[PDB]
Amino acid sequence: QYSALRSNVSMLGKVLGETIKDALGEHILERVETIRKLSKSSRAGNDANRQELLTTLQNLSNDELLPVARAFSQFLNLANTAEQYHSISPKGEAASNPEVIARTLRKLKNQPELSEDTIKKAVESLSLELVLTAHPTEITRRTLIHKMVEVNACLKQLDNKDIADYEHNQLMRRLRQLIAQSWHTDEIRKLRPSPVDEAKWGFAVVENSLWQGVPNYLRELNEQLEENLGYKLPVEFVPVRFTSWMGGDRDGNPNVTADITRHVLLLSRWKATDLFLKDIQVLVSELSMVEATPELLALVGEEGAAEPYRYLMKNLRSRLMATQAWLEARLKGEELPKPEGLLTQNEELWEPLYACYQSLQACGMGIIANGDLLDTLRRVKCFGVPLVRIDIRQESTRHTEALGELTRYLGIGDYESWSEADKQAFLIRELNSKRPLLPRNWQPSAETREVLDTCQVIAEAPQGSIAAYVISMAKTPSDVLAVHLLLKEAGIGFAMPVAPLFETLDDLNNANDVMTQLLNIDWYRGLIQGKQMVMIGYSDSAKDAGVMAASWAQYQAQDALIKTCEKAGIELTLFHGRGGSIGRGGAPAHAALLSQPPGSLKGGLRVTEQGEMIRFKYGLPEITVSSLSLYTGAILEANLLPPPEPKESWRRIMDELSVISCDVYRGYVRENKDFVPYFRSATPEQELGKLPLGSRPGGVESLRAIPWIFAWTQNRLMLPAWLGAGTALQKVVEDGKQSELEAMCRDWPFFSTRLGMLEMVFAKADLWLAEYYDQRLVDKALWPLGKELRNLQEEDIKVVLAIANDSHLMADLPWIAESIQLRNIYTDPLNVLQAELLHRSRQAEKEGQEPDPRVEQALMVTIAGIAAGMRNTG
Amino acid sequence: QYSALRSNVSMLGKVLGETIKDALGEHILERVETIRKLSKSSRAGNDANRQELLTTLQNLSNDELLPVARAFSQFLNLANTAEQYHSISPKGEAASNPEVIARTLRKLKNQPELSEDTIKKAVESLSLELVLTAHPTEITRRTLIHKMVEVNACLKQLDNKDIADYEHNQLMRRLRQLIAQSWHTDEIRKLRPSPVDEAKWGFAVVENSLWQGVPNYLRELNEQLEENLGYKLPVEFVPVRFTSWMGGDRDGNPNVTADITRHVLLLSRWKATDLFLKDIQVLVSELSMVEATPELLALVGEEGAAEPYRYLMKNLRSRLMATQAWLEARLKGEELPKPEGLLTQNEELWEPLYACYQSLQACGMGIIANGDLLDTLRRVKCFGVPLVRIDIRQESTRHTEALGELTRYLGIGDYESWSEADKQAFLIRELNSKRPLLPRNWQPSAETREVLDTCQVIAEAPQGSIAAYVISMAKTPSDVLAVHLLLKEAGIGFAMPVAPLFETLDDLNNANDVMTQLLNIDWYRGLIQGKQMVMIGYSDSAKDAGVMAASWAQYQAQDALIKTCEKAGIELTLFHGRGGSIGRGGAPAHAALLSQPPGSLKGGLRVTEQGEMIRFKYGLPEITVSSLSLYTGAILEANLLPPPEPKESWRRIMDELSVISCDVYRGYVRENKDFVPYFRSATPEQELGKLPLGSRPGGVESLRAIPWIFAWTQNRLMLPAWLGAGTALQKVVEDGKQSELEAMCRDWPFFSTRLGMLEMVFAKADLWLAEYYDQRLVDKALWPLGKELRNLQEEDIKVVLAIANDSHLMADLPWIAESIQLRNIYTDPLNVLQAELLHRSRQAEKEGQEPDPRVEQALMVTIAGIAAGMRNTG
Numbered sequence A, B: 001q002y003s004a005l006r007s008n009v010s011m012l013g014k015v016l017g018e019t020i021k022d023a024l025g026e027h028i029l030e031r032v033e034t035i036r037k038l039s040k041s042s043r044a045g046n047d048a049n050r051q052e053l054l055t056t057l058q059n060l061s062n063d064e065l066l067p068v069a070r071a072f073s074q075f076l077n078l079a080n081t082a083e084q085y086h087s088i089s090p091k092g093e094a095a096s097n098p099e100v101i102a103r104t105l106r107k108l109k110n111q112p113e114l115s116e117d118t119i120k121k122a123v124e125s126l127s128l129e130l131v132l133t134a135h136p137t138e139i140t141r142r143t144l145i146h147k148m149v150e151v152n153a154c155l156k157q158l159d160n161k162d163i164a165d166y167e168h169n170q171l172m173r174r175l176r177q178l179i180a181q182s183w184h185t186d187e188i189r190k191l192r193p194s195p196v197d198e199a200k201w202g203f204a205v206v207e208n209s210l211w212q213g214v215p216n217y218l219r220e221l222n223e224q225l226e227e228n229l230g231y232k233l234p235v236e237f238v239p240v241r242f243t244s245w246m247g248g249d250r251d252g253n254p255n256v257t258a259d260i261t262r263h264v265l266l267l268s269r270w271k272a273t274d275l276f277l278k279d280i281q282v283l284v285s286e287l288s289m290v291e292a293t294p295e296l297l298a299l300v301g302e303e304g305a306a307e308p309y310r311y312l313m314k315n316l317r318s319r320l321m322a323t324q325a326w327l328e329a330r331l332k333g334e335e336l337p338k339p340e341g342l343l344t345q346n347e348e349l350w351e352p353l354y355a356c357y358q359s360l361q362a363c364g365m366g367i368i369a370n371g372d373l374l375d376t377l378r379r380v381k382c383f384g385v386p387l388v389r390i391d392i393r394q395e396s397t398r399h400t401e402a403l404g405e406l407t408r409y410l411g412i413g414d415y416e417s418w419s420e421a422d423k424q425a426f427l428i429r430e431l432n433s434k435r436p437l438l439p440r441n442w443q444p445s446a447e448t449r450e451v452l453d454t455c456q457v458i459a460e461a462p463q464g465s466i467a468a469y470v471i472s473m474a475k476t477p478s479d480v481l482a483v484h485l486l487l488k489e490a491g492i493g494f495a496m497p498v499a500p501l502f503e504t505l506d507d508l509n510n511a512n513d514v515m516t517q518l519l520n521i522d523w524y525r526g527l528i529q530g531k532q533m534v535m536i537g538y539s540d541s542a543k544d545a546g547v548m549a550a551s552w553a554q555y556q557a558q559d560a561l562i563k564t565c566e567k568a569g570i571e572l573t574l575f576h577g578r579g580g581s582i583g584r585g586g587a588p589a590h591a592a593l594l595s596q597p598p599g600s601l602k603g604g605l606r607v608t609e610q611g612e613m614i615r616f617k618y619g620l621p622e623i624t625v626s627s628l629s630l631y632t633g634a635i636l637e638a639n640l641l642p643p644p645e646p647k648e649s650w651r652r653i654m655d656e657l658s659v660i661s662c663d664v665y666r667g668y669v670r671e672n673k674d675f676v677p678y679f680r681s682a683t684p685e686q687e688l689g690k691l692p693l694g695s696r697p698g699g700v701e702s703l704r705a706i707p708w709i710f711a712w713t714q715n716r717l718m719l720p721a722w723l724g725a726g727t728a729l730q731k732v733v734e735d736g737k738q739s740e741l742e743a744m745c746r747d748w749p750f751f752s753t754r755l756g757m758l759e760m761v762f763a764k765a766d767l768w769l770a771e772y773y774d775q776r777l778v779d780k781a782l783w784p785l786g787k788e789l790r791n792l793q794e795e796d797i798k799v800v801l802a803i804a805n806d807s808h809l810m811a812d813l814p815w816i817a818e819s820i821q822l823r824n825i826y827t828d829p830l831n832v833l834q835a836e837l838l839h840r841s842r843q844a845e846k847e848g849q850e851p852d853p854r855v856e857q858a859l860m861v862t863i864a865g866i867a868a869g870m871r872n873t874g
């Protein structure tokens, strides 16, 4: 059924193989073949070749390491490429097929309890906001997204019979240059990327995929609405918005200073003028019609009656080149009086464009208006002047420490030592105060100053540049009020969404109480304007108590918050962190969104997309359209057909599973005193912090979530994503409640979704490679622990399969199952090679010798490649 | 066999029809349908509807004229579009199929007398230079070539089964906007275009088609050479060059002044930096490799060792932006000291690019070098700094008058009254003189000054900007020497190709004597460096004595010149004017090139492409590749397998046909005193001069060739292209020499080619529409002449068919036959409508009333549309 896929992968492999024979001989190709074959033979049980593989690897000279690593990495990359094409291909999976949306609409029409009026309102309340986050393992000096768009185009064109002989020969010639380019044009980062680089990477995603993707999705959305429901959404209604954390998230990242943020903000505005300039140039050429409505004829008046439309567009172009010119000056550190037509508000762009639209529509030229004009008009509300808004995120602790320094300096006392009650008292008092609190000439510590300057950047940036201020480690009501106070002493002249981030088991359990108390403060209710945003940190919570407990805690917290706000008349918007079932993408994501507590999506969908997944969710415009469509279908269905409330007996099983699984999980991660040492040997955890990967960088409770998950993904154990789940399920089965579990799996989405996430993690895990790493990097004294963790997975897989009444992992998702099988095959060699690299690297620093550049770079290629093949592992 | 074509035309017609129903109701659509049906019924003989058609037309209100005309014009345009796609389509005619070239190469290999060595040298001597000329009937305010490229892309994509439902729906949506745009975005020129506008039009052809077309053709050429002959041409060998007359040809065009030429020259340089800038930007991104040859490492040295290639390309970009900046200043009339890295020679661009190429090739990266780099490298030699070189053309008379004014002022005497001998004496004396002749402070007449300033522009422009100086109406040796003298007194610091243009029957007969005398002047031989260029003006010669005589005279002149130069060791390059069998394009052109006198193409191919045909020969990159390939195949075959020498008896028949046909032709065009009045009534000759068509504008001997041919093409008689040919053939048949004629047709290419050209002209002619014009615009007293000219064609068609032993016109060319049939159908209504427009227009000016703007613009649409449907008619 996937013959086209197998073929394409085989054809690309040849082109790459030939490109390698030219560059640096065929010796490298022989090595890649030997390692590939030996590795496969070792997995089959041939212990003779296992030794042969080991020897083969130790004999690779440092001069071969890089070429070899790149070979495997390239084959994987072409495999991924072929896979992505097969997904959006009509003859393949047809991911960008508008049918995905129609299927949902039709389902809703056949529902008796649903009246067209209640459905029409659900569509009008649609709201999606995707927040781009940095890519943790981007090793290339420059972004190569545009190239992949071209390789895809070649595949789309070649995917056709009745194709001319000389035409096919021409496409192949181009494809050969494209591959060759990737092999010779590879600049591994020598240094760690700066926030500004990560920000630019995000800009590349916008123009190469989102720019076309959003308008195309909106185009299809309306078309399906009218065809199935009988009406389109108003032109002014654009339910999609893109935001970013690059340059805004400074949580545990000292490199993101107030200046970097200020810089990134100008840079975004600049890029926005660059992209809108191209759009406007088109309109200035096409919109030449003469006939226009009286009103429009006014805005242009004299000198503009000859070409009314062409007129306004040229003033817009002059306007744009003006601001762009100014920005380029400010970006170079040059101060200069801001021009007249400086653009700072999307309204300034929308006004003239919308006018032209209105006119053309009236004077009988809708086909034109709803063409390129409608696209630019939508890009204005989705991207606008700032291009992509950004959130600011800092930990509660930093705010507390800065305030404590401020109070001690003024002689008021020590904020850091006051009880929660006293803090609230102090904050409410100063929030209502008209007398300033912040000293004019103050020389605070470095950290405190950064907290103060960041807030100054927020107050200076045009309104609409910053979307929200997120508070990591939020625990108490004062954590939320503190930030509102600093923003006040900064000169903020408008409402700023401040969202608490509960990223701990305890904090999630208290989340509802914390919000109840906040909403009881009359003053605070009048500040939020009936709108509150809360962030759920699933990844960090899972790292704290295990995925089982984490999941159940998240469900209860959301459900409580939904009701607490509903009752208080506050519109609650849940902000989802990275990972989890919601961050799986594709069909599973569509399902995970529906399995949330009733009302979870009434406040719209807002999720932070993980960097390592951007390519697979928004890599190409077609993929972008697919993703947004899946989300849209999920939101509508979840708001009209919410999941059933769980039976009292189910909640009791979840409470027990939560406790048992948390116990097992912390039993190893915390109690077991041989874990940490084992962890640092079996995984490349230590090198993830040292190598130049990403901007931001003790014990396990000191490590960040991403590194936690990534480390266990490199050695293929995936521990963080299953460690205690199966063991707790096993226990409940021994109590004869297996039938209760099976029932939950069938009738309670939350539960079926949790088991599904587990099935996928097991599908990517590789117990054989995990054992391989132990025998190469772990001390024989620690092998017992490793073998114990592996047997644990084997047992968990059986229990999970039994409760799902299946014979093999994720049989409900044949396509994804296949895709995974394909990627595991091409990823395999990188793992086998990485063990050797980690061994040499660790032998050098242990010998005192200096780190070998070749060994280090080769390591980066595997880390980045393995991550690219594994995708979402948590 | 042409079902795909019929379908596409029908599908586009619908989309246009629907687009019309929205814009301005369906009344217009009903009119278009009524006129279409009535016209067809009148042609069938229904005299009842003929009156109905007449009435229908007189009832059209002036407010309907424009919309209606545009409707017919649009349908024709879509018909042409469909036709062009069908030509380059693989399932269609596959015009851009590399097979066109391979077929020729294989033919040459199977030839015993041809040794691979003599063939290899023929390929190395390959030389094509295409000279773009203005489009005589371009009524749009802006160029719309880029749009047609997109409409074609939509057709290519839709031309595929296994195409997704939602994919087809998406392509159709785009196609509908494209059509709608053409219907609402139509700005008819209010004023006559300036030379600068025509020049910009030429630039649009370069970037939208030639820029990609040339490199693609060169790519295919080499690939076929190696595959069939076993070798590719050296990278430095680029046998194609593009030149233009826009801004250079001032023959009978007072609007092309020395300033316009100076301006157009800067503008070209400017555009060249714009296009090369884009090319360089790519290389600056892709060429990032580090490994480079020692030599290249030198050119970059320190600070350039990190990124050698990326280095040179950035200096090139700085270089380009520098000159571009300067040009923009000079273009605004602002003087400023020229920068340092100012580019003025192609060598400056080729140097760095070629170096990078050399390196990449050595360090094992040929796949990269022969990619985008090879393309830009070829665009350098084909276009270069000036983008497109230009020729200067002025009539001999102007040179004579300026020199006579100069000599009278100096008291030397009167050049204008000296015999040919005295002129030669004077010119040779002053050409060898070291004492200047031109006064420092002289106030000559306007005309003389223009002649002097133009030469000053040539001397100031960077060397390589002007390709040749053509002399219209060349008659004597002194005409050639005169120009060389003026260029000398101008400060010209290099060799400048000066080509005589023989555009008269007498001048063509004397051409050889004139050149023999020139080559006998030892001084003149040392000036031309063994290279001489001569221009043949077939169009003007045909207008002088008829196509038959013209053709025979051209053949004899070329043959004589070839031998005269061969004997004198001079390399002769024949420059072909517009029209004729050589300007037919496609297969006929390939044939016409081969039917030329042996040696005609040893000096390379240089022809001026007619404006009205640029779209059909270079409209799309694929069409460009097709055209250049046909030319290439023709040149090689003609230089290795020349046509057979004609039998003495054949030359005698041609001498007689020449005389008889010239007699008949001048019998009407000159002797008949009722011709001129009839001519001014039956054709829109008078309005072609008055309407704002083209830059350049008595009796018939005062009218220009283009207008001569165009006028008779609008009323569908095509008189200029056949008037005396058939009558002379008829006479020779009455002498029982029909068998001699039939023999010539079979064994002498020149002759079969001449008859073929006639068959095509008759295929486009429409005797029914020609009669329609007479009954609407010609005085009943002149009808006898008209009916006589029509019967003449009827008789000529029979004779031509008999000598070709065929039943229908051009049965040897089924595709072109079909294409013509299709175009005649969509052109038909424009002719029927134009008669009414011409009638109203002529009734107003005859009534004294002012010209109605609506009537005039509608007329322009028909003139331009009819010309677009008829294409090459002379």
Ligand SMILES: O=C(O)C(CP(=O)(O)O)=C(Cl)Cl
Pocket (backbone or CB within 6 Å): A251, A503, A536, A537, A538, A539, A540, A541, A576, A577, A578, A608, A704, A705, A706
């Ligand atoms: O829940 C969280 O802690 C996280 C992960 P981070 O603190 O490593 O960014 C998110 Cl993204 Cl919400």
Ligand SMILES: O=C(O)C(CP(=O)(O)O)=C(Cl)Cl
Pocket (backbone or CB within 6 Å): B251, B503, B536, B537, B538, B539, B540, B541, B576, B577, B578, B608, B704, B705, B706
């Ligand atoms: O032979 C000629 O006279 C012509 C036609 P023109 O004098 O109308 O440009 C050419 Cl192009 Cl060569």
Ligand SMILES: N[C@@H](CC(=O)O)C(=O)O
Pocket (backbone or CB within 6 Å): A583, A584, A585, A586, A588, A760, A816, A819, A820, A870, A871, A872
């Ligand atoms: N994204 C898939 C897994 C994968 O393709 O790697 C899932 O979450 O189920």
Ligand SMILES: N[C@@H](CC(=O)O)C(=O)O
Pocket (backbone or CB within 6 Å): B583, B584, B585, B586, B588, B760, B816, B819, B820, B870, B871, B872
């Ligand atoms: N170009 C064709 C005629 C035409 O297509 O109009 C020919 O010269 O034979």
Ligand SMILES: [Mn+2]
Pocket (backbone or CB within 6 Å): A472, A503, A537, A540, A705
């Ligand atoms: Mn966190």
Ligand SMILES: [Mn+2]
Pocket (backbone or CB within 6 Å): B472, B503, B537, B540, B705
């Ligand atoms: Mn002429």
